[PDB]
Ligand binder design. Structure first.
Ligand code: FE
Ligand code: FE
Ligand code: FE
Ligand code: FE
Lengths: 200, 238, 200, 238, 200, 238, 200
């Protein structure tokens, strides 16, 4: 069979991943430009939302050293790839859960609808990659919104998950935090209620 | 017009199949007995047609859609892709690749084929693609079946796809056949066995190429074709 | 010594070569644009001629499944490499003998003169590749004309064939088909009167 | 009725595939976590149904004719034959062999299969044959195509034919799969790879059998199935 | 030591097992004579019972593509090995749960008693082989009856299972379906309340 | 009369000696130049004579007594015995084996042999034996000696016995030669070199069999013959 | 691939083949029972014919040491396999060409029509195997009759020979020898007029 060069193998990001990529959250001095949890500046188009959550291990204890990276379309359903701190909206961002913040948070807009390769619309979603000590290769998942029930139900990606009860673990539950529209999304790594993870 | 500014590496006639290879019965009476007369290359030999302007239809290279009578052919959907280079490894761009083949059952859409496997009403079996700037070509077709033929009393051709390649000159033109990796009928064939060196046989075996397959759709195979090396003339007639 | 990549090996073209390179001849539907046996359009310059011939095996039997590709200069001795169906003259074409047609034909112009790499003129000629079932690697020949005996006598290529009687096998005999100028060039693959084949 | 006069050689559970083989995704949640409870054999285990009187139609074993809607299937016509013996090499006569498979394109005639290769209107894909006095069985069918499935993101099943074999008791019953010699998709499969020992994988590869082929008609393959050895009881309960 | 020929390895039966062993259930045309889920004809001797059950995976989800083969004694405790569609009782049958039927059923008689190789009686039981997609090698169990507690208490096979609570998993619960005597036997492949499986 | 119920495995013509083997000189003008035509097997090729009722004389397989002119032959007394099977390993019972050979000095009892080694007044050199139920045959004779012949200027045929075997059909009939273990002339013989594969030559070598020799009497060689494998027809004309 | 045991390889019958199988023609004393050139005794059913011929090498000289074996149906088209010297007709026989008989001869009856495996009648014919010094493996051919032109023309075996002119070499030419109906059939081993030989 044709063999190409093999990819460089993955290793765990380690306990100190915050020093190289979550400079602020490790309380080390920053540089002029850091990639962080503010995808949209307060004047970007769309419906502004705050996302928050916790991550669990399989004993149900909190993962306080995890590091996340998110990639979502803007409110028009367009991916913005030229990362710039001056833009109003960036499609990429990074967050973390620390010993002092058991919780991560991200500030962004509800993403607009994008289609898959066959032409079929996907429900609005945010792609998430999770890294942490103990995770040898990172975990891929999608966060979806509990208020988009109809689109969620015709989603060609959510419909590849066989068991209906598994599809729920990907649905963020709407709530409010000081007059701002927020969604919670916990991640269970292992066990009862195990979040669905992807391979692509 | 065409200019004489190219020379082509002599062919290796002991690498290629000889003309007389008796186990392939038809070769007996179809091979010469006199020696080939060697001649220097001239403009006649070193130039050949350029097919950049030939008009290609849209499904010329897609055999799943180019014959069509409201349907998909039955058989293993596969992509057959590869690159055409010359002996120095230099890519051969805008070159005509033509191929032909049986259906999933080993039947040829030709009046002369009377084998009992049926014709598939959505399959013809011909494709043509012109190589791109880096020498790449690609086809989409179904994997051919083996077929029985009248040489020995129980001879079968391994599954294969015939290929024609122009190249840059009449000196590089070549017709050959592609086999499929792993096929146990390959070492048994008298036509494959017209090739004496087993390393030369390996160049005709297309490899399973999982990296070019379309998931949940079709598999692939990679077949690279090396044509005679092309070099600038030097120090000729002083 | 220095070794380069090996050239991919030849294989016979098989009985069914028609289905891939001689669509009409195998009585299958043609595509819009096909490479066939009309090198010259009626209003092309040069003398219009019809070529024709038969192919014999070594038992004196006709080869009815043969396929030929020809390459020749135009009337002013120039090779026209840009293949196009809209030219008045293309230097290339294909023909085939069929079960039906034991005979191949080609419509073209008599080629003009060209020089060899050393500047010596070659007699007018047509370069021919023959392919068929039973032929593992195609066979290269040249078709010359009996009415050009002065130039044929001085051709630097025909003079490389040692035995005069062998030279004759490459001279097409002028004749008339439906009272139109024609030349016949039969090929003997093997035996008595075997046509000369080249290697280059 | 049935008598307890047979014992069967214990199975080699490290030879067969284990229940938990994670690369085959569906096995995660479908394999137990507790250990199997071993029990002595009794009449319950050592007896099983005898299928000599089941009524077989005339084309039960011929899949080129048993589904038929005025036609031959498209694909490589092949004979799949072999003998069923037990571990001591003793032939298993009058035993039920059942098999099922895709069409030339890898499509299963089952509502649940949505792969884009079409159904062939003359092919169903089921056969059954009862072994003869020397343990022989034979089928005539077309060679199945590989198909994509949803395990990894680009996983394909090599071409295969599923087989069910009764044997003499419920202790010998076995479902397995046949692969085809040479197929390069075999080492890549997670289901084949649920088998840890490569010598065990080789027993599942049917071999090209030129001696059983019908010239100018169809090829063959030979697949021998070895069931648990059968022995008379001795010195039991003193 | 002495080694014999190895047994051919098992392979999972696959999602499509229906097409080959459960023709009707896959909604394909049947042959004349099929091996199915009616072990007993209406006028067979013994108490007529309907069996039914579900198959669960380790996530508590239903196995809808499972296939089962049962082997049991008749009412007088004898194994009827001669399979024939014209008998009043066959000791063998097959059933399947379908996407359609999440549930399998079988119509038979309550088996009589049989002795083990040592002459000790075993409680009435049904021998079951389970096959499905994700199961590499089939799984062997026995279905016993809750109304035979006296015999179940002395069964030499059920007594080889060390933990009493594990014994319970093989006891079918008497019930009534369309007011006709029935027993339910669900199987848990994995997890909490996992059914006992045997090796012999 | 005979019925068409068998097919025979096809001959491997690259295993047997080819027709044109130039060091064996007479093969030059006696080998065809056109390819053999292949034809399917019919009742003509699949039936043949059965000799179960030819009336053998009692000494027909015993060359120490069947020529007899008052005494015994001079030379090494040896039994030549073996079995005839088919390629599936199945014995071929009631077949005719015929054999003819020279005397102890290499002279053949024939008008044209003018070799100067004399004739043996008590030896003729011919035997025939029908094989038993089990495929066994046997002869008793003397070991023939080598003989020079007119091939190259100093060619010696090694010691040998000619065999003729019928089998079950004119498709299986064969003529061959038996050589003797360790003869240093075996590999220099052009007739033996007409077989290209060294493992095909080993099957023509009879091996010393001390187990079958009569103590204080004669030695024994074992020579086993395998004829084309015989199988029942299957799936024919559908 | 499955490999069976290999067949014992063929060797040339040698110059002295007559001593073992053509006892009479080598002028050595015979045994009580010999297999020879009298297939039909004068009272067997059918049309009695005498066959004769010569064998040629490729220089056109006579092969005087050849040995032939024939197998043909009787006049009803039936193969008689139980060889017996008392029967009126035997389907098998042997002949030879010697230093003193440059010619072989056989006495038999014209064979009746047999069908091939597909049901199709074959023209009447006699199967011939030719052995001789110089022939390393024996040659198979068929003798057909020049007076059965129509059947010969629909013969499925004669029609597998591609070239019509090759089919003639298999046709024996009728003649008469002392009031008896005879057919001549020469065999050319090599060269101009090369008899067709088979592989089966
Ligand atoms: Fe570190
Ligand atoms: Fe082909
Ligand atoms: Fe399958
Ligand atoms: Fe000899």
């Amino acid at each position: 069979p044709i063999e190409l060069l093999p990819e460089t193998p993955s290793q765990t990001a380690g306990p100190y991943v915050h020093i190289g990529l979550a400079l602020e959250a490790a309380g080390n001095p920053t540089r002029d430009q850091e990639i962080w949890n503010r995808l949209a500046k307060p004047d970007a188009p769309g419906e502004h939302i705050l996302l928050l959550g916790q991550v669990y291990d399989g004993n149900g204890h909190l993962v306080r050293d995890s590091f996340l990276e998110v990639w979502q379309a803007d409110a028009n359903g367009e991916y913005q790839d030229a990362y710039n701190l001056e833009n109003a909206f960036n499609s990429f961002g990074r967050t973390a859960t620390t010993f002092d913040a058991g919780e991560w948070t991200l500030h962004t807009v509800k993403p607009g609808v994008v289609n898959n390769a066959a032409g079929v619309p996907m429900a609005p979603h945010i792609n998430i990659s999770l890294f942490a000590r103990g995770i040898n290769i990172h975990l891929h998942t999608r966060l979806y919104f509990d208020d988009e029930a109809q689109a969620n139900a015709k989603c060609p990606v959510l419909n590849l998950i066989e068991q209906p009860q598994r599809r729920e673990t990907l649905i963020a539950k709407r709530c409010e935090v000081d007059g701002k529209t927020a969604y919670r999304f916990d991640i269970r790594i292992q066990g009862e209620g195990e979040t669905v993870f992807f391979d692509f | 017009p065409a200019q004489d500014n190219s020379r082509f590496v002599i062919r290796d006639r002991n690498w290629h199949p000889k003309a007389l290879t008796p186990d392939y019965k038809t070769s007996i009476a179809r091979s010469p007995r006199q020696a080939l007369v060697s001649i220097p290359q001239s403009i006649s030999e070193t130039t050949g047609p350029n097919f950049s302007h030939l008009g290609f239809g849209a499904h010329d290279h897609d055999l799943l859609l180019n014959f069509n009578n409201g349907g998909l052919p039955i058989g293993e959907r596969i992509i057959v892709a590869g690159r055409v280079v010359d002996q120095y490894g230099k890519p051969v761009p805008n070159t005509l690749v033509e191929m032909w083949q049986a259906n999933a059952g080993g039947r040829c859409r030709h009046k002369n084929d009377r084998y009992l496997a049926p014709l598939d009403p959505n399959f013809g079996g011909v494709g043509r693609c012109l190589t791109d700037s880096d020498g790449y070509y690609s086809f989409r077709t179904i994997k051919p079946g083996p077929y029985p033929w009248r040489n020995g009393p129980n001879d079968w051709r391994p599954a294969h796809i015939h290929f024609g390649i122009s190249g840059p000159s009449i000196a590089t033109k070549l017709i050959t056949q592609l086999y499929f990796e792993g096929d146990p009928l390959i070492p048994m064939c008298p036509i494959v066995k017209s090739i004496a060196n087993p390393e030369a046989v390996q160049q005709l075996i297309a490899k399973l190429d999982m990296n070019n397959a379309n998931p949940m759709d079709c598999l692939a195979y990679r077949f690279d074709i090396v044509l005679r090396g092309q070099r600038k003339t030097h120090f000729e007639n002083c």
